[PDB]
Structure formats: structure tokens, C-alpha cells
Design a protein around this ligand. Structure first.
Ligand SMILES: Cc1cc2nc3c(=O)[nH]c(=O)nc-3n(C[C@H](O)[C@H](O)[C@H](O)COP(=O)(O)O)c2cc1C
Ligand code: SF4
Ligand code: SF4
Ligand code: SF4
Ligand code: SF4
Ligand code: SF4
Ligand code: FES
Ligand code: FES
Lengths: 214, 118, 52, 35, 262, 106, 91, 429
């Protein structure tokens, strides 16, 4: 339910004021240095990521500016922006909550977490809070596929979520508090819930099992 | 040279004035099929097509306006034109040159061929 | 066979394939495989044959 | 457990630091194959 | 240097690098195709050129796959037939029923290829998609609902025209072809994108709704607007010039004519 | 039913006509739809086969029930687009009823 | 193939017609130039034009070829051949 | 060896898999990583490739292609283009969450693997394309790379061996299709993440139009351990042609959802019960299991009862090891709904390039939704099977095939449920 066409608007017009900060341009220089000469076009994705990280969302002026920076056709930047989901071609809230809804999370009742988020915020999936502090969307295995229902807010992973736990996280963000990223069931990482079924012994140490030939 | 002109029955005006064009039909640029462009064809010169006053329908007096004859080879068309005594202009068949195509060239390392978008 | 017999009008207005064949069959017509035949039937006045 | 510390530009800042450690890149011979 | 490949059991000598489709053309077989264009870079996206090679488990893309010595290209094998039928079914699944109102009607590669290689009925019981049209100028009437995402227009604009304006936006079934912003595709050779488009997504705005291909009489001629000498085909109906189409001449105009000429 | 001419100028009825009696010329209407500027059928050349109505994809050209339309001058037989539209407007009730009574068979 | 769409083909008549075509060719090698049986079981004998009367007389009087009825005699005009007109006798 | 699945902690390659130790260089070296890497590099690219072949390491990304042969493809005289190596870190396959653990908890192991592999294939530098959502994992990886650069492990004269090698990290932008190797190459190059059409094979033409090899995170990370401990060590675990130790991301309706490193050719039921505490509600409560992520077809409980979690055995079971993301589904699971959700995932993650994928996947999603509601007829199931077969084998990438396979598995194993649901829907109306 998104448009892949752009209509000039007061918020999103070619004259919309966007420009990287000088430190951001230095970061862009480093990024371009990473890619070989004659293939500076490879930086379109990371430079667009920097633009999104700075502005919050990507206006058309941002895409044009990235095209200018990398001396690439603007249409290619438009294609990159549309193709990849992470890019926010439209303004989004401060906290962009992303609740996974794929089969693994569904089996773990991620719909309960999604419903809890909807009830607490009062907005439906895809909507943004009137304060413009929260937004809701759906995702796939963000690496927590074995970590129960999980939502990704901004760049933070919250795994093994419960409805009440998700309400707690939302309330912490609403009160300007950063919750601890990671599993909220008490488990650390992806360790078996009922104690370490493997790696119980300490690490063997260097030089262990080294082949005689080496 | 076989002279069937007296036996054809064609009026003398449409035996001398006619300018037969022997050619292979070109491929319609809209489509990509080439099945039509495989046999030689013979057509006559286009003439006046005025408008019928009553309805506006196009009227013609050319009796050979719609005559198109297909021929297996150019020599067949030439011989048929000679038999009927029609001045014939032959257009040599234009076959597209074989073109080297490489999908890899789309991702060249130091060549212009590298495509910007897929 | 919608490449020989035109599809039903309801199908023509619903199926994309039917509309294409309905368009082609009535504009171009079905292509008959190259060949010749003399099919004759016992018509009321006698043998009626067609050398197609 | 230091993931909490990582901020927005952490990845970009680390890449900027890595720039000195990196070595000269190859060249296609053109500024861009568009050229 | 020529390697000996076989098409339907018929031996044919081809230069190394020859694509399967080109060898089939050499023996006289025109494999059905929508995305492949002789003068455009190989794409391989339409998937209509799929053909079976003897002793090969998976059908190959004749438009892209280069031949290998000893390959026996089974152009008319059951695998190839079924592949073509399935791909045509997929192409027509979402294609709008616009044939009566489509200017490409009567000269549509989709129509003829469906009639010759595709099936005769549809199993699509769902609802078709609809794409908003995009204005690209005052010459090319655009109905993107009929687009089959062959990417011919994009490649042409990128290479022959040299104007990098057209492109694909989005991904999946929602992938729309056209400029992301409202921009007019300006080129001296823009008109040719009408011809390259296998379907009636791109249609000549002046020639739109005027006449059908079967009735128009074709007269090969030469252009006089410029000194290039581009060979043109003057399509005339009822003693009236209806449209001007390029005539193939590798040495002068290849397959393209200027917008003024058209 | 809205009142717009069903004919969308596909011209396939012109092609199918075995006597080449239908002459169709179309241009984009002011609105922008495919509306014919000329729909001429000379009944003096038509064979009343019915291929035209079987070909039309919008049920625009339909042979009506009137068999008693003899004229005194040859020119009258040649029917203009206006004549066809007027005939449709006159006989629409019966034509629609007959189509409703036969469309299932077709 | 099978199913109602495909037309059923009878191979027995095909074999019979091929055998009889070979029979005619052997009896008349002087004129018979080519013998073909169509897939729809229609035997066709191509004869040099000088053999119009002999071949027909054989096909009419011979005990094992009693084609005593000229169904249709027609001509096909193919302008791409030197002998454009092709005279076809249906018996 | 005939009974497998008894992997010991002394034989587990990933020792900090659970993040209970120091992921940084100090911890990695204390656990045996970055040990005598100079000798490994100086041993010879041919030696490294031979060790990989002796280990019998196969593609841990899901393809299962022999890793030794695939890497040997690039061990050729340089053609003048700078050879590169790409490490696939997208991990977009639903249920697959191992590579994340490797990157976030043992990044230095992966970096050493990158160095060793690059030496084995004469690569100028390595680009690790990590998923954009894995921002914190990317930060950890970058910290590790910085530590390696400062310590001299990587960079010019890497590990004091003279080899000049670099490790780059490119963050993704949320596209499952980028997991595909050629699509990954295109994404790195800055174009839309649409897969290429082989040939040209990536080994010949890859990133920046240069000889490139794409390898999975686990596949690369196990290479230094394979070299140090010997190929025989890796081969000892698992059956022939299915050797090694594979990370198993047990997920779904299991009592202890977790990721555990277990020996290859391990009995499925054992693996589920040994680590995940068994199926929720008991074994008998299990409905079906998806062994490899989502692309691999489901196996019913009957087959799940006695089956080894290895490539060949699962291939016999009309499925595959894939990423070994065991998705356990209990009998309280609407299998139709789960498979439909997977199809929807594929629909929303399709590149749209190839016609069969672009249109067929969406068509299948529509039909699957109708099946979930029961609003269909029994023949439509056979129609759906035919559609899946048409998509499979006729697409540029394997996303179409990996979306046809779930539908085929659902039909082949639970057609009665589909037919019964359609009957129920008919009775309601
Ligand atoms: C749709 C699709 C998604 C894929 N996703 C991944 C992935 O997330 N991680 C991965 O390692 N390989 C993925 N692959 C496989 C890659 O194309 C490639 O074969 C693999 O990264 C190389 O693994 P290997 O070298 O260990 O054999 C995917 C393939 C396809 C077709
Ligand atoms: S493009 Fe071809 S198939 Fe599509 S509506 Fe137009 S004529 Fe019909
Ligand atoms: S608009 Fe036409 S040429 Fe362009 S991608 Fe679509 S079908 Fe191809
Ligand atoms: S009357 Fe029907 S068939 Fe004739 S042009 Fe109009 S729409 Fe087409
Ligand atoms: S019914 Fe009349 S107009 Fe229609 S096809 Fe027959 S002769 Fe032509
Ligand atoms: S089976 Fe696809 S339309 Fe595809 S290269 Fe694809 S994500 Fe594709
Ligand atoms: S399916 Fe939701 S985290 Fe894996
Ligand atoms: S013509 Fe072969 S895939 Fe397009």
C-alpha cells in the first residue's frame, strides 16, 4: 500500500531544502573511497542511507543531491530509493516500530504484540501518531527468527517480546527513555531457554587441534 | 523471350505504363516477426485515388491497384514480368547482418557497454 | 479450440486469452496448414465436392 | 553488551576511521563508464 | 573457429559466442521473444525465449545463453512448448482486455505470440492489476496498464537515445516502468520507443485511434526531412498518409527514425 | 444505457465483413475516446450474414428485426453513421429484448 | 494425439493408398514422376503432362484400378513455377 | 561412524555463539581464532583450497554446492581485473538467524575466514554485504575490522605474510532478493538488487565486473578452523557428502527456540528434542516441520519421525537442508495460513524482473489466500500445482523456485485439509 510515483508537493518538491552537513560530506568521501575508481556509483545505497539518517526521510531533493554528489543519473537514484524498503520516501515518525509478521513470528503469536502496539498508540498499522512520535510497519526475520516476537524500532532490536513488555518499551520511548536492546525474556542472545545445551565447557584455547603440517 | 502480352488480355495502357516493383516486403517495425519477410513479391505502381462525392469513399480506376503476386525467388518475378511485358524494378533483399551479443558485456569492468540499470 | 472456433461472448469479455483469439480469429482468421484436399458429400442434387 | 552504545553514525564513523587503514583502490581507466 | 552446434538435429556452424536464439535464426527458427532485441543489450527478463537443449535438465534462455559445441537445440520439444505456454499465461494473467481499444491491435507481438505459442484459455480467476499512466511527452501516448515489463524502452533510452530518464520503480508485481518524477522524455529519437514496445503500452499520439494495421497499405520510401536518407514505410489508407514507419537499412537508419521524420 | 455509443472503433467488424460493406474511420473524440467519425455500411452491398454482430466486442452493431425497409432510390440503401444511430435509437427496445433472449445461446 | 479436438486418423487406408501408389508407379514408370499420400489419406500421383491420356486410361480400365468416374478436373495457377498452371484430375 | 549428532564442545567451531565471552580480538584469540594465520596464508592458496575440499565443506547458504570446488573456480591466473571476494551476510531467509549470531558474537572468526579465503582465491579485498537491519551487528563487525587493521591481521602485509587484503562492510537496505549472489553483486554495484542471468558466472564476471565469489557467513567463518584443525577433522563429523557441523536455527512451536551448532546428519527428532526441549505439547502435537528456512518444502510428522538433517537425506525427503532453519509447527497451526504467509513474504520480496516470478508469485499468493478462506474448488489445487511447476525452473533467480516449493509441499502433504476447508466454506454458504 505505497505509491511508486512522485508528485511534487510543498513538503516534497525539487526546491525542498536538503543538504548534507560538512561532516556528512566527509563520511560520504570515506564511503566513496571504499569503492574502486570508475565505480563511484556503487555508493548510491550508503549515501542514500546517510541522507536518510540525517534528514529522517528522503525528499526528492535528497535523491537529486545524491545523484549530483555521485555524478549518477537521477533516475537510477530514484530506482534505488523505490526498490529497497528501508528508504523512507515519505516522512516517518521518530520511532518507526517494525513488527515482524512472517510465519516464524506468527507461530510465536507476533500478532498479539502488533495488536498491543496498535492499542497503546491508538493508530493502525501503517499510520503515524498525532504527535508524530511512533509509526508501525511489518517485517521478516531481522535475525530474531529464533527469538520469539520481535519489533525493530529505529536501529534497535527488541526480541522475545510480550504484549505488556512491548507496552513497556513503547512507554519508555514515549517518556524519552531508551530501552535495552536485545531479548526481553531474560535470555541472553539465542542461548537455549532451558540452560546452555551446548558450549557448556570453557573455550579450548589457542593452539588446540592445530594440524601437524600447519 | 516468351511474349504472352497478346494472350494476357491486359489493356495496352496497363501493359506499357505499368511499373512493376519486385521486392521482398520489409518487416513491420511494430512487430518482431520475420515470417512475412521471406518471399519475394511483385506490386504495381500506385495511382490516383479520388473521393466518391456521395459518401466520401476512396475511388480508383486502376484495375491493378490491389494485385500483389508472391514469388519464391527474384528470378521467378523477373521472368513473370518479362512474360507480361511490364517494366520491372528489382530491389535486392536486405538481410540484417549477424550481430554479436554478450550478456556479460552489460557488466563490463572497463567498457562503455556496462548498463546503468537493468 | 479457441484458435479455430471463436470463444463464447461471455468468455471473450472476461478471459484475456479469449479476447485475443476473438480479435485474431475475426480479423486475421485461423491459419489452415498447407495442403490440398477434395472433400465431397452426397448433396441433395448429387456429389458436391470442394478442392480446397 | 556494547550494542546499546552504538548511535546513528557509529557505522559511518568507523568507516571514516578505517579510511586511513585502507590501501589504494584500482581504477577502471575512466571517471565513469558513462564517460 | 566456428563450433558445430545442432538445432533440432540439424547441424549448423556458428561463431563462438553465438546465442542459442541466433543459431536458431541461422537454421530458420525464430524463437518467440519479447525482451530480446537485436539492437538492444540482452536482458533475459521476459523469459519467453526459453528453449530445451537435448540432455539438459533445465530449459535455457536462448536470447542470452551462448551456444556450446555439440548442443542440440530442441526448439519444438514438449519442454519448450510448455515453457512458452506457461510464460505467455503469466504475461496475460494481469494484461488488461484492451485489444479492441489498443492501437497495437492487429500488430501486437503479444497477440500473435499468444496465438502461435500460447494456450487458448485462461485459468486466472483473480482480479487484474491496474497501473496509473505516466505522461512522458506530447508524442508517445502511454498506457502503462498494458506494460509487460520487457525493459526494452529503458534499454533503448539508456543506449541508443542516450537519455537516462526511463526506469523501473518499485519491485515485484507492483514494479512500474517510467520516470519516477513527472518528466517529459525529450529526444530526437524518442519516437522509436513506440516501435520497440512489443505491447500497446506506448502508442503514437497522432496515430492513436486513427486506423488499424491490416487496412493500411504500405509503401516503402525515403525520408527527405534530413540528409541522412532514412528509409521509411509510408502507411497509407484510402489514399491518405496515416503513419510513417522505419524501414530496415543497416547502413543508414538501421531500425530507427528521427521524431521529425516520424 | 448511459447513452454513449458502444462502438469503440476497433474496426474488426469492418475486417470480418465478407462483402467489405462497412467503412469505418475513427479519430480521438474531444473527450479522448475511440469514437468513429465515419461508420458507413451500404446495405446494397451487405449480404446480411451477421458476422458483424458476432464480431463486435461491445454489442454495438447488431442486425435489427426490421425486414421492411425497402427504398425507392439506390442512394437511400447506403446507410450513414447517423442513419445507423437513428435506427438503433428507434429499434433499441426490441433489439435489447432479443439480445436478452438470445445472449445465452451466443 | 487424442481427445475430441484432434481429428482421428486411419492408418490402414494410408497403408493401402501408399501400396497402390507404388503399384501405379511400377506399372507406369514412363510417366509417373512422384507419388504422395497425404496424412488425411488422399493418394496423389504426379505425372508428366505427356502421360495424361495413358495414365488416366490405365486408372480407368485396369481391373485393379477401376476409377471410372472423373469427379473433378481443375487447374491451380502458381506463377512462381515455369509451368505455372497445374492440371489436377480427381478420380 | 553411523550415529551422528553427538557433537562435543571440543568440536564446535563457533565457541562464542551465545555471546557469553569476548567477541573482540582478545576473546577471539583466547578461543583459538586468529592463530598462525600467517602460516595459513603462506601455506598456499592451493593448500587452503585442498583443505576445504578434504573437509568436504558444502555451501552453508542453502545451495549446498561444494565450497572447495566453488572457491577453486577463482584460483586461476589473473585476467587483469582486480579479483574480489563477497561474503553474503544478508540472511533474509525466514527462520534463518545464524549468520547474525556469527557476525555479532564471533566477528573476528569471520574476518580471519575472509582473509584466508581471499588468499586462497587471490582476492584484492572482501566486501561483506550485511543486512541493513543488522545495524548493531554491522557496528560490531566494523569494530572487529578496525581492531584487525590496527593489529596488522588484515591490511597491507596481513599477519606479516605479505598479502595485501582488505575487508569492507556494505550495509543493505531491506531486500530479501539481495540474498541472491548476483543480486547481491548488483546491490553492491549501486543498481537495483535484481539478480543477473548466468552465464556469465560470478567467478568470471562479478562485483564491479571483476572475478568475484559470493560465500555465506558460516561458510567463510568455518574455513580457518577447517585449515587449522585439518580437513579430516571437519570430515569426521557428518556422513560422506554431508560432512561438517551446521548451525540449526530451531524456531516456531518449540519449547526452547534457539540456535545450536550440531553435527551434520543429525536425526531431526533428536535435534528438536535434544536442544529445543521438543515440540510444544509433545512430539505427537507436531504437525509439520520446515527444515531449511522457508524455500525448502515442508515434511510431515511421518517423515519427521526418522530423518537425518543432512543434504542428501532431506533431498530424499522432498526437501533440503538449506539454511537449516527448522520451523516447527504444532497441530494447532493452520498449515494453509503459514504457507500462505510464506508466499506473501515471497510476493513482497520479489524483484519483479522475470515474468514468471513477477506475476506467478502474486497469482499463487491470491490463490493461497482464497485457499486459506476455503473460497475455491478442489481442481484449483491441481491448477496451483501446475502454476508452481511453471514458475519453478523458468526464473532467473531461485526465489521463484523457492516460492513454488512451499506450495508444492503444502499440496503434496496436506491436500485433504485444503479440500476439507473448501467443503466447509461451501457448506457455510
Ligand atoms: C532468493 C534467495 C535468497 C537468498 N538468501 C541468502 C541469504 O540470505 N544468505 C546466504 O548466505 N545466501 C542466500 N542465498 C544464496 C546465494 O544466492 C548464494 O548462493 C549464497 O550466498 C552462497 O552460499 P555458499 O557460498 O555458502 O554456497 C539466497 C538465494 C536466493 C535465490
Ligand atoms: S497490447 Fe496487444 S494484447 Fe495487449 S491489449 Fe493491446 S492488442 Fe491486446
Ligand atoms: S512500456 Fe513497453 S517498452 Fe517499456 S517496459 Fe513496458 S512493455 Fe517494455
Ligand atoms: S460497431 Fe463494434 S465491431 Fe464495429 S467498430 Fe464499433 S465496436 Fe468495433
Ligand atoms: S451483417 Fe451486414 S454489415 Fe455485418 S458482416 Fe454481414 S454484410 Fe457486413
Ligand atoms: S524468481 Fe524473481 S521476478 Fe525473479 S530474478 Fe526473481 S525476485 Fe525475480
Ligand atoms: S519470522 Fe519474524 S523474526 Fe523471523
Ligand atoms: S527474449 Fe529471452 S528472456 Fe526475453
Amino acid at each position: 500500500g505505497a505509491l511508486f510515483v512522485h508528485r511534487d508537493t510543498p513538503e516534497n518538491n525539487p526546491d525542498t531544502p536538503f543538504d548534507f552537513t560538512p561532516e556528512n560530506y566527509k563520511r560520504i568521501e570515506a564511503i566513496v573511497k571504499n569503492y574502486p575508481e570508475g565505480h563511484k556509483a556503487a555508493a548510491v545505497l550508503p549515501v542514500l542511507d546517510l541522507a536518510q539518517r540525517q534528514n529522517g526521510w528522503l525528499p526528492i531533493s535528497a535523491m537529486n543531491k545524491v545523484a549530483e554528489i555521485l555524478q549518477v543519473p537521477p533516475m537510477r537514484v530514484y530506482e534505488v530509493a523505490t526498490f529497497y524498503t528501508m528508504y523512507n520516501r515519505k516522512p516517518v515518525g521518530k520511532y518507526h516500530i517494525q513488527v515482524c509478521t512472517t510465519t516464524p513470528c506468527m507461530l510465536r503469536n507476533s500478532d498479539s504484540i502488533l495488536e498491543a502496539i496498535q492499542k497503546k498508540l491508538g493508530i493502525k498499522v501503517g499510520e503515524t501518531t498525532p504527535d508524530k512520535l511512533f509509526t508501525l510497519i511489518e517485517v521478516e526475520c531481522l535475525g530474531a527468527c529464533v527469538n520469539a516476537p520481535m519489533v525493530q524500532i529505529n536501529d534497535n532490536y527488541y526480541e522475545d517480546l510480550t504484549p505488556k513488555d512491548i507496552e513497556e518499551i513503547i512507554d519508555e520511548l514515549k517518556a524519552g527513555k531508551i530501552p535495552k536492546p536485545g531479548p526481553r525474556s531474560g535470555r541472553f542472545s539465542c542461548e537455549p531457554a532451558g540452560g546452555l545445551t551446548s558450549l557448556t565447557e570453557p573455550p579450548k584455547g589457542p593452539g588446540f587441534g592445530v594440524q601437524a603440517g600447519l | 523471350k516468351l511474349d504472352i502480352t497478346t494472350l494476357t488480355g491486359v489493356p495496352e495502357e496497363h501493359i506499357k505504363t505499368r511499373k512493376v516493383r519486385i521486392f521482398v516486403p520489409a518487416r513491420n517495425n511494430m512487430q518482431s516477426g520475420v515470417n512475412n519477410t521471406k518471399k519475394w513479391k511483385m506490386e504495381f505502381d500506385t495511382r490516383e485515388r479520388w473521393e466518391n462525392p456521395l459518401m466520401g469513399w476512396s475511388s480508383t480506376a486502376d484495375p491493378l491497384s490491389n494485385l500483389v503476386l508472391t514469388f519464391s525467388t527474384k528470378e521467378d518475378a523477373v521472368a513473370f514480368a518479362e512474360k507480361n511485358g511490364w517494366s520491372f524494378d528489382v530491389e535486392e533483399r536486405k538481410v540484417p547482418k549477424p550481430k554479436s551479443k554478450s550478456y556479460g558485456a552489460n557488466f563490463s569492468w572497463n567498457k562503455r557497454t556496462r548498463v546503468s540499470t537493468k | 479450440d479457441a484458435k479455430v472456433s471463436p470463444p463464447k461472448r461471455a468468455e471473450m469479455k472476461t478471459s484475456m486469452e479469449s479476447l485475443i483469439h476473438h480479435f485474431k480469429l475475426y480479423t486475421e482468421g485461423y491459419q489452415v496448414p498447407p495442403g490440398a484436399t477434395y472433400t465431397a458429400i452426397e448433396a441433395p442434387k448429387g456429389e458436391f465436392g470442394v478442392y480446397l | 553488551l556494547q550494542h546499546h552504545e552504538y548511535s546513528t553514525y557509529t557505522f559511518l564513523d568507523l568507516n571514516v576511521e578505517l579510511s586511513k587503514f585502507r590501501m589504494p583502490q584500482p581504477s577502471s581507466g575512466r571517471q565513469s563508464p558513462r564517460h | 573457429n566456428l563450433i558445430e552446434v545442432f538445432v533440432d538435429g540439424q547441424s549448423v556452424m556458428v561463431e563462438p559466442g553465438t546465442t542459442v536464439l541466433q543459431a536458431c535464426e541461422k537454421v530458420g527458427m525464430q524463437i518467440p521473444r519479447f525482451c530480446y532485441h537485436e539492437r538492444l543489450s540482452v536482458a533475459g527478463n521476459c523469459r519467453m525465449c526459453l528453449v530445451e537443449i537435448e540432455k539438459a535438465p533445465k530449459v535455457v534462455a536462448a536470447c542470452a545463453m551462448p551456444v556450446m559445441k555439440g548442443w542440440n537445440i530442441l526448439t519444438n520439444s514438449e519442454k519448450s512448448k510448455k515453457a512458452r505456454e506457461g510464460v505467455m499465461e503469466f504475461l496475460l494473467a494481469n494484461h488488461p482486455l484492451d485489444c479492441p481499444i489498443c492501437d497495437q491491435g492487429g500488430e501486437c507481438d503479444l497477440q500473435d505470440q499468444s496465438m502461435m505459442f500460447g494456450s487458448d484459455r485462461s485459468r486466472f480467476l483473480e482480479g487484474k492489476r491496474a497501473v496509473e499512466d505516466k505522461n512522458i511527452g506530447p508524442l508517445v501516448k502511454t498506457i502503462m496498464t498494458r506494460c509487460i515489463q520487457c525493459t526494452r524502452c529503458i534499454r533503448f533510452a539508456s543506449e541508443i537515445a542516450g537519455v537516462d530518464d526511463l526506469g523501473t520503480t518499485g519491485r515485484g508485481n507492483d514494479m512500474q516502468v517510467g520516470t519516477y518524477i513527472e518528466k517529459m522524455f525529450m529526444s530526437e529519437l524518442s519516437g522509436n520507443i513506440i516501435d520497440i514496445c512489443p505491447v500497446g503500452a506506448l502508442t503514437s499520439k497522432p496515430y492513436a485511434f486513427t486506423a488499424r494495421p491490416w487496412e493500411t497499405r504500405k509503401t516503402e520510401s525515403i525520408d527527405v526531412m534530413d540528409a541522412v536518407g532514412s528509409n521509411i514505410v509510408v502507411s497509407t489508407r484510402t489514399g491518405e498518409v496515416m503513419r510513417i514507419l522505419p524501414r530496415m537499412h543497416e547502413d543508414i537508419n538501421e531500425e530507427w527514425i528521427s521524431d521529425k521524420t516520424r | 444505457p448511459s447513452g454513449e455509443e458502444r462502438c469503440i472503433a476497433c474496426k474488426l467488424c469492418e475486417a470480418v465483413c465478407p462483402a467489405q460493406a462497412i467503412t469505418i474511420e475513427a479519430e480521438p473524440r474531444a473527450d479522448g475516446s475511440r469514437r468513429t467519425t465515419r461508420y458507413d455500411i451500404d446495405m446494397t452491398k451487405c449480404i446480411y450474414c451477421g458476422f458483424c454482430q458476432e464480431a463486435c466486442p461491445v454489442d454495438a452493431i447488431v442486425e435489427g428485426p426490421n425486414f421492411e425497409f425497402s427504398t425507392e432510390t439506390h442512394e437511400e440503401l447506403l446507410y450513414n453513421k447517423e442513419k445507423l444511430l437513428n435506427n438503433g435509437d428507434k429499434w433499441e427496445a426490441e433489439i435489447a429484448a432479443n439480445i436478452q433472449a438470445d445472449y445465452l445461446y451466443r | 494425439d487424442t481427445r475430441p479436438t484432434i481429428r482421428p486418423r486411419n492408418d490402414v487406408v494410408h497403408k493401402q493408398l501408399s501400396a497402390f501408389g507404388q503399384y501405379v508407379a511400377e506399372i507406369l514408370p514412363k510417366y509417373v514422376q512422384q507419388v504422395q499420400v497425404s496424412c488425411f489419406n488422399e493418394l496423389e500421383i504426379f505425372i508428366h503432362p505427356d502421360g495424361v491420356i495413358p495414365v488416366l486410361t490405365f486408372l480407368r480400365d485396369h481391373t485393379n484400378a477401376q476409377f471410372k468416374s472423373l469427379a473433378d478436373l481443375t487447374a491451380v495457377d502458381v506463377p512462381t513455377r515455369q509451368n505455372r498452371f497445374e492440371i489436377v484430375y480427381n478420380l | 561412524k553411523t550415529s551422528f549428532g553427538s557433537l562435543k564442545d571440543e568440536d564446535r567451531i563457533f565457541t562464542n555463539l551465545y555471546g557469553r565471552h569476548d567477541w573482540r580480538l582478545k576473546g577471539a584469540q583466547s578461543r583459538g581464532d586468529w592463530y598462525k594465520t600467517k602460516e595459513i596464508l603462506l601455506k598456499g592458496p592451493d593448500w587452503i583450497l585442498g583443505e576445504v575440499k578434504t573437509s568436504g565443506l558444502r555451501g552453508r547458504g542453502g545451495a549446498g554446492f561444494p565450497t572447495g570446488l566453488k572457491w577453486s573456480f577463482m584460483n586461476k591466473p589473473s585476467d587483469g581485473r582486480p579479483k574480489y571476494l563477497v561474503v553474503n551476510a544478508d540472511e533474509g531467509e525466514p527462520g534463518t538467524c545464524k549468520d547474525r549470531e556469527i557476525i555479532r558474537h564471533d566477528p573476528h572468526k569471520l574476518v580471519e575466514g575472509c582473509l584466508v579465503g581471499g588468499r586462497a582465491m587471490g582476492a584484492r579485498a572482501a566486501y561483506i554485504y550485511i543486512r541493513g537491519e543488522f545495524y548493531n551487528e554491522a557496528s560490531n563487525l566494523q569494530v572487529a575490522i578496525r581492531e584487525a587493521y590496527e593489529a596488522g591481521l588484515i591490511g597491507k602485509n596481513a599477519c606479516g605474510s605479505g598479502y595485501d587484503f582488505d575487508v569492507f562492510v556494505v550495509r543493505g537496505a531491506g531486500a530479501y532478493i539481495c540474498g541472491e549472489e548476483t543480486a547481491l553483486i548488483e546491490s553492491i554495484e549501486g543498481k537495483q538488487g535484481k539478480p543477473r542471468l548466468k552465464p556469465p558466472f560470478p567467478a568470471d564476471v562479478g562485483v564491479f565486473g571483476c572475478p568475484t565469489t559470493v560465500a555465506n557467513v558460516e561458510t567463510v567463518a568455518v574455513s580457518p578452523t577447517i585449515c587449522r584443525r585439518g580437513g579430516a577433522w571437519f570430515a569426521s563429523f557428518g556422513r560422506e557428502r554431508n560432512s561438517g557441523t551446521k548451525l540449526f536455527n530451531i524456531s516456531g512451536h518449540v519449547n526452547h527456540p534457539c540456535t545450536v551448532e550440531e553435527e551434520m546428519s543429525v536425526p531431526l527428532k533428536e535435534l528438536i528434542e535434544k536442544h529445543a526441549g521438543g515440540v510444544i505439547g509433545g512430539w505427537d502435537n507436531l504437525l509439520a516441520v520446515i527444515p531449511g528456512g522457508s524455500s525448502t518444502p515442508l515434511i510431515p510428522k511421518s517423515v519427521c519421525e526418522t530423518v537425518l538433517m543432512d543434504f542428501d537425506a532431506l533431498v530424499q525427503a522432498q526437501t533440503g537442508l538449506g539454511t537449516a532453519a527448522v520451523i516447527v509447527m504444532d497441530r494447532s497451526t493452520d498449515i494453509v495460513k503459514a504457507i500462505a504467509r510464506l508466499i506473501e513474504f515471497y510476493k513482497h520480496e520479489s524483484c519483479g524482473q522475470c515474468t514468471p516470478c513477477r506475476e506467478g508469485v502474486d497469482w499463487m499468493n491470491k490463490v493461497m489466500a482464497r485457499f486459506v478462506k476455503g473460497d475455491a474448488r478442489p481442481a484449483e489445487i491441481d491448477s496451483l500445482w501446475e502454476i508452481s511447476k511453471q514458475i519453478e525452473g523458468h526464473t532467473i533467480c531461485a526465489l521463484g523456485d523457492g516460492a513454488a516449493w512451499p506450495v508444492q509441499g503444502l499440496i503434496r502433504h496436506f491436500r485433504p485439509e485444503l479440500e476439507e476447508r473448501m467443503q466447509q466454506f461451501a457448506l457455510q454458504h
